């Protein structure tokens, strides 16, 4: 379970004392937690231009320690909410907040929020490192690879206010080589990172379908809405129409369909009839058919929920003498075959898919740094621990070990920090 305590002397981070005047719309913040008995109450969000945000002290993830001089450690959500609502308009509330506990991180990311976070100190330190004679890369890597992505957005903000220069511009000018690529990738938000990588994979008729496939096939609906949004903000065109430009045929069809990000959401009930029905349909459309009905495959694989499809592919083995991946490698070729194999891997076991892509990026002569870097950046706060345990199970040695063999210098150290562990 996450960390709890009823005693303020045992809380870790830093303490904030604020006074809010109750407005006609309350104090302007929502609270989360406090149903499970030993659960902190944390600030989930703030109403822009509302009393809490206008005051400027409260932040998301802050733990509510006490209200009006009464400790509420271990209060239920219902007891606390009642305290706030009883305060009449124009009266004020005193809030003691503990900063340093996380809200809503993935239990499977390798990279965690830094608990003693001081954006200003890091900005100062990275500036001092950038301006060292012969740049201090160690400090830059040491700091940025051990901050969460949203703490990096804060560092970038503080750096810009301290120097009047964007952080990412200052680091592009101070860094070089693969280290530059890692650090610049780390500085983007996930949606910005994926958008720019999608853009770079479509930089012309020389399209890198491998990279377009990796991102489009592996990102969830939520992730894709955000990507479609900031891609149009960043590049003043819709992601869909750049895909239509640089792709064609059934491959374009399947890429357009996935990139929309309107896959069915996880149902509450398992639909055994439709599972068998889909499994039958996939077989009818391929192995037992002359040629292959590609539209039926696109339809089923892009529209059903991921847990439903996991059971479809199992149930498909009842009908086909070849499983879904082996059937794909017999029925299609080229970019379309590649995309299908990538998608089915992501549905069946997304961490194993990334582990195999990481293994492929390093196993031979040299390194496919582009793939190695994008995976370590994009998955580090998502499922890197599952990726590592899948990789170690299959290949015997850790992911850490393979990175050590394939990379060197500060680049290697940055990738091992993103990896996590000491091995």
């Amino acid at each position: 379970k996450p960390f709890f305590t009823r005693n303020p002397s045992e809380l870790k981070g830093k303490f904030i004392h604020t006074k809010l005047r109750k407005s006609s719309r309350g104090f302007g913040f929502t609270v989360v937690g406090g149903d499970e008995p030993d659960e902190f109450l944390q600030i989930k969000s703030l109403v822009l231009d509302g009393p809490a945000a206008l005051d400027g002290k409260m932040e998301t993830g802050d733990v509510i320690v006490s209200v009006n001089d009464t400790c509420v450690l271990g209060h239920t959500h219902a007891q606390v909410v009642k305290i706030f609502q009883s305060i009449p308009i124009g009266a004020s509330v005193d809030l003691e907040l503990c900063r340093g506990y996380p809200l809503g991180s993935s239990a499977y990311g390798s990279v965690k929020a830094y608990t003693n976070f001081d954006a200003e100190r890091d900005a100062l330190n990275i500036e001092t490192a950038i301006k060292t004679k012969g740049v201090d890369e160690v400090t830059i890597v040491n700091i940025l690879t051990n901050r969460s992505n949203e703490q990096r957005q804060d560092i970038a903000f503080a750096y810009q206010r301290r120097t009047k220069k964007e952080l990412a511009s200052a680091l592009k000018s101070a860094l070089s080589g693969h280290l530059e690529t890692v650090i610049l990738g780390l500085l983007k938000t996930p949606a910005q990172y994926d958008a720019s990588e999608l853009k770079a994979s479509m930089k012309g008729l020389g399209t890198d379908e491998d990279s377009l496939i990796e991102i489009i096939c592996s990102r969830t609906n939520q992730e894709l809405q955000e990507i479609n949004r900031v891609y149009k903000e960043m590049y003043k065109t819709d992601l869909e129409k750049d895909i239509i430009s640089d792709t064609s045929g059934d491959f374009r069809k399947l890429m357009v369909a996935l990139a929309k990000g309107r896959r069915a959401e996880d149902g509450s009930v398992i639909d055994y009839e439709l599972i068998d029905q889909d499994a039958r349909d996939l077989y009818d459309a391929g192995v037992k058919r002359k040629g292959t009905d590609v539209p039926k495959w696109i339809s089923i694989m892009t529209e059903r929920s991921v847990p439903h499809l996991q059971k479809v592919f199992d149930r498909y083995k009842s009908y086909s003498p070849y499983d879904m991946l082996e059937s794909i490698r017999k029925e299609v070729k080229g970019d379309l075959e590649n995309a299908f194999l990538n998608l089915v891997q992501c549905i069946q076991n997304k961490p194993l898919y990334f582990a195999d892509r990481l293994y492929d990026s390093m196993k031979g002569k040299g390194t496919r740094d582009k793939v190695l870097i994008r995976i370590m950046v994009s998955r580090s706060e998502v499922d890197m621990l599952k990726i590592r345990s899948e990789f170690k199970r299959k290949y015997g040695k850790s992911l850490y070990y393979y990175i050590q063999q394939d990379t060197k210098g500060d680049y290697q150290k940055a990738l091992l920090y993103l990896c996590g562990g000491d091995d």
């Binding site: 302007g28 913040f29 929502t30 609270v31 989360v32 149903d35 959500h77 909410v81 706030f84 609502q85």
Partner: peptide, 6 residues
């Protein structure tokens, strides 16, 4: 799932 606007 515990959320409420205060």
């Amino acid at each position: 799932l515990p959320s409420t606007t205060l």
